[model samples]
Target: KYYGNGVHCTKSGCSVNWGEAFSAGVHRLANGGNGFW
Candidate 1:
C-alpha cells in the first residue's frame, strides 16, 4: 500500500494503477499468476 503525488506503487516501488493489486491475487513469486483472482 502506497500513495504519493497522486499515484500508487508496488512493494518494489513501481508506478501502477489500483486496477491491479494483491486483492486480485497477484503472485510475484512467478510470472504466470498475476491477478488470477
Candidate 2:
C-alpha cells in the first residue's frame, strides 16, 4: 500500500490530507478505508 499523506499544519505537527494525496491505499487509510484503494 502506498503512503502519500499530504501536508496539513496541525497542533500535532501535521495531519493527513489523503484526498489530494496520491497513492495506493493512502486514501483508504485516511478515511477509514472509504476512499481510493
Candidate 3:
C-alpha cells in the first residue's frame, strides 16, 4: 500500500444500500413464486 492508515476511524470500510438487493429478491420471488425465505 502507498498510503498510510494513520488518521482515520470506523475500521476503514464501506457499506451499500441493501434495499436494492432485497428488492431484487422480492421481484424474483414474486415472479418465480418460489424461494426459500
Candidate 4:
C-alpha cells in the first residue's frame, strides 16, 4: 500500500500502508504534517 519511507510507493507488490501503519504508533501525523513538531 505504501513505501517503507512512509511515502506512497508502487502499487504492485508494495509492502504496507505507511499512513495506516503509523496511525497507531508514535510516527502518527496530523494536519498534513510529518509529526516532528
Candidate 5:
C-alpha cells in the first residue's frame, strides 16, 4: 500500500514512508553503525 517518491499510484496507496525506511536502512547499514565509534 505504498508508492514511490511521494507519488501514490494506487487507489489506496500512500507515499513511501522514508523516515521509517531510512531508520531501517540505517540499522541495516553495517548493523547500526558498527564501524563508527
Candidate 6:
C-alpha cells in the first residue's frame, strides 16, 4: 500500500488502488482463511 503521495505503507493510513488491494488480499485476515468465503 501507499499514500496519496506514493509513500509505502501497510495500514489504512495510506491509499491503495483496487487492484493492489484485491491482489494483496487485504480483507483475508478479517474474513479468515486464504481468501475463501
Among these predicted structures, which one has the highest lDDT?
5
lDDT of 1 by residue, 1-37 (tens): 5453335656777675645544343444454665664
Write one digit per residue (lDDT tens) for candidate 2, span 1-37.
2234555656756656656564535545566755454
After superposing candidate 1, which stretches have Cα over 4 Å from the reference? 4-6, 18-37
Task: Supply the TM-score for candidate 3.
Answer: 0.38
RMSD of each: 10.0, 8.6, 11.4, 6.9, 5.4, 8.2
Best by TM-score: 5
lDDT of 4: 0.53
Query: What's model 3's overall lDDT?
Result: 0.46
Candidate 2: the clashing residue pairs are: none
Put down candidate 6 lDDT per residue, 1-37, tens digits, no spaces. Answer: 4543334556646455667556556455468865668
Ranking by lDDT: 5, 6, 2, 4, 1, 3
Candidate 3: regions farther than 4 A off? 1-15, 34-37
lDDT of 4 by residue, 1-37 (tens): 4444555546555555655567635444454474555
**Stretches of model 2 off by over 4 angstroms after superposition:** 1-5, 11-13, 23-37
Each prediction's Cα lDDT score?
Answer: 0.51, 0.54, 0.46, 0.53, 0.56, 0.55
Question: Which of the two, 3 or 6, has more TM-score?
Answer: 3
Candidate number that wins on TM-score, 3 or 4: 3
Ten contiguous residues with the weakest lDDT in model 4:
23-32
Pairs in steric clash, model 4: none
Cα shift from native, residue 32, model 1 (Å): 43
Question: Please, what is the TM-score per model?
Answer: 0.19, 0.26, 0.38, 0.25, 0.44, 0.27
Tell me the deviation in Å of residue 28 in model 1: 33
**What are the per-residue Cα lDDT tens digits for candidate 3 across 1-37?**
1112222233464343446556656676678655555
